[PDB]
Symmetry: C3
Amino acid sequence: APLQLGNCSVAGWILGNPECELLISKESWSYIVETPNPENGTCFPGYFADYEELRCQLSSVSSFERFEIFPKESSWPNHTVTGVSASCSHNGKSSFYRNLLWLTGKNGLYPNLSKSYVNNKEKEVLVLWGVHHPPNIGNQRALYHTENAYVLVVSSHYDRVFTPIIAKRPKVRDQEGRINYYWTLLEPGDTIIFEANGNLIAPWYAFALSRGFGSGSGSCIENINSKIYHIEDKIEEINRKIEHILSKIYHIERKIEEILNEI
Amino acid sequence: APLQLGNCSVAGWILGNPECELLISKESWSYIVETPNPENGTCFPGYFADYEELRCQLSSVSSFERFEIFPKESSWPNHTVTGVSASCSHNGKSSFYRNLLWLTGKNGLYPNLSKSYVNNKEKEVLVLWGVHHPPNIGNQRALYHTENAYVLVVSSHYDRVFTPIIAKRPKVRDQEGRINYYWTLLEPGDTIIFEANGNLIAPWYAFALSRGFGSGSGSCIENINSKIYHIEDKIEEINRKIEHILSKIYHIERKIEEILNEI
Amino acid sequence: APLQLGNCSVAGWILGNPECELLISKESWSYIVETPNPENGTCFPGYFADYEELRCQLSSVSSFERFEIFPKESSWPNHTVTGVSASCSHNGKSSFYRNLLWLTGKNGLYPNLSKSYVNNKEKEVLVLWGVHHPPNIGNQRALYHTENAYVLVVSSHYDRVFTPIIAKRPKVRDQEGRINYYWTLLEPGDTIIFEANGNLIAPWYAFALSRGFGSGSGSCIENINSKIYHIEDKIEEINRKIEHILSKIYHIERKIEEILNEI
Ligand SMILES: *[C@@H]1O[C@H](CO)[C@@H](O)[C@H](O)[C@H]1NC(C)=O
Ligand SMILES: *[C@@H]1O[C@H](CO)[C@@H](O)[C@H](O)[C@H]1NC(C)=O
Ligand SMILES: *[C@@H]1O[C@H](CO)[C@@H](O)[C@H](O)[C@H]1NC(C)=O
Ligand SMILES: *[C@@H]1O[C@H](CO)[C@@H](O)[C@H](O)[C@H]1NC(C)=O
Ligand SMILES: *[C@@H]1O[C@H](CO)[C@@H](O)[C@H](O)[C@H]1NC(C)=O
Ligand SMILES: *[C@@H]1O[C@H](CO)[C@@H](O)[C@H](O)[C@H]1NC(C)=O
Ligand SMILES: *[C@@H]1O[C@H](CO)[C@@H](O)[C@H](O)[C@H]1NC(C)=O
Ligand SMILES: *[C@@H]1O[C@H](CO)[C@@H](O)[C@H](O)[C@H]1NC(C)=O
Ligand SMILES: *[C@@H]1O[C@H](CO)[C@@H](O)[C@H](O)[C@H]1NC(C)=O
């Protein structure tokens, strides 16, 4: 069960790259296949935090449900949700990652938000979000009506603050700015809180994972230790087989000595 | 030598969780056993930095001495050391981690401190400390008489600055705030300096480790490479045994051909 | 091909420690040998970021060219480039890392710089730079004529901001201050931009690597997974050999039963 992934990255699949037709009735898997140099991976350029840990941790998964965490129509009543660009153009139309919503202001000044979610799925929940990094102060003002903004994310067992870095970057996918991505896991009974006054790429969809019992915490360091441990056991088994055959070879030799003794 | 640890985490054992009766005349070990879902692990909720590296690095230890680094009675002459709470209640009495001291103000305004320690143990020293993160600005003022504080920690080969994040978190162990934990190692001849004007969970006890020669730097990446290297050697050994028996099987066959030739 | 490295660290070799005579016509290698406790490793005390990843990632390299990225004589027309100290004294003369330039002010106030490089080598480029951390505000003013400075580094796929920490550290190599080191990799077609208004240890030389096809991304987690995978294949091979010999031992026994039956 390597999954159906084609010329996509893991990030493209979970973020919702418009070009990855992976939104099918596919549940569990034992390994994830992805293309090292994908075409449908990155949609909008930026750094994906702890990518290696996420792709490693997700290597073994049971039930895999995609569900709404902060529904587009009701979660941000007076925010702009038409956060689209040429970067994610699909069939000629401007767009964005399906599981994310890039929020901007309208009419007046971009208001600040505070939203939360409680995990009642009896599954672990993977929440993805990002941080906007404008190429120029002019856009920081145009989008959020501010020269200063922060994003605060906390949860039962998580504390992080993000700040924007405003600078012109090398042109990538025709963009001068960047969007970085971050993620956390929630256990049943936990809560996540999002507070921001600008530059927030809000979570829309989240993944509820049963995961199963094929791993521990899921940290890549544990997954690798598991493989090594497993190998060590195979080595002891073969060592026993060696002693077994050495003994038998010994006995069979003895008879060769005797059949000879008979003549 | 797996150690005597019961329903405790490594963090609970080294931080001094009141419920972990591990303070006995126990020295060296070859592996640390701990409970994946402990009851006496976390005392006061928060994030433990580089936990995986610390538990991995400590997997092999020689002499293990617990000693005072900054004695409660003399290290902070005009600070409040009665830093206790319900979170660590023991036998009905409010308390805290045994190896840590949560400092607060009194009488006037919480003064700033600057303390240092020089490693003259001829052993490597593990120093644990934490950072307070109030649920509300009201408590930041009540405890340290400030709306702004920082913690600076430097050593021969370490440079880090911590800042508080003030926010209401999901309720964990009846707390709305958090305490994060950080740690460093000192070599013989080194020095550590602690500077703070608030939100410091000061070190009280520290551990002097001889460690031994069963590892290199102790980084988990090296410990795992050591295991792999060790396996590779076992593989070469068994491969030699295979060639040995193949040769002998060949010779024994030859005689089977001849004893047959005799008849 | 372990390389010619003697009593040097990897950092000393790539940073350009005056005492490491490694600047010879040496190209590719299959492993890097270094001294665990070197004399010619550290030149000026400080923390080297992601050292383990860099030494691991460079374990397998093809063509290895050292070239100028920001030539000393033309890249900073009105900056001081005589950034030398006793720490790197060579043959009695004050000096510094050969591949780095420590910039300071002169005449007037230290001006701010903005420099960039585009990778047109058809190779991946390793760029090394550092950040100055004065022991005292007095030196921050004396060197850069400021009480506040920042270093901004961005690239096609990199975003980081550094700030100075001004404090007196434990004396190491006769220094009270520190210089930290950071590094990035550029792919062909990428760009790196350096912006600073003080405390910049500028890049002078950079390394153009062909790397080869003996690894993937080069992250240490992948290099280790490769070794484990390789071992697993060896195990399957030996398991087949075991079945082979067990079958043959069986047949040879049968004849031993019959030669006996003949008598
Ligand atoms: C992936 O790219 C190859 C060409 O390199 C193409 O033939 C194939 O159809 C692509 N697959 C998908 C799912 O786009
Ligand atoms: C905007 O929506 C928030 C709820 O998300 C509400 O509290 C606030 O008063 C609204 N502001 C306006 C101008 O409607
Ligand atoms: C940010 O939140 C404050 C309340 O803490 C509110 O007064 C202010 O108007 C908000 N900012 C914007 C742009 O609405
Ligand atoms: C650990 O928990 C079990 C119950 O799950 C209990 O029987 C045992 O006594 C506990 N051990 C300690 C040291 O508390
Ligand atoms: C508080 O103690 C410090 C030493 O730790 C001392 O320097 C300072 O003067 C004392 N302040 C008062 C009011 O006693
Ligand atoms: C903090 O240190 C300064 C000296 O640098 C001192 O003047 C000030 O009073 C200290 N703060 C408090 C609350 O004592
Ligand atoms: C390394 O140190 C040893 C002494 O421990 C010395 O004999 C040797 O010549 C040194 N090698 C180099 C390259 O300095
Ligand atoms: C210093 O050099 C920069 C170019 O690196 C130039 O733009 C600036 O005008 C120069 N300043 C002076 C005073 O020459
Ligand atoms: C820093 O850059 C600004 C322009 O953005 C310039 O006006 C200022 O003089 C520079 N600082 C110094 C010390 O030259």
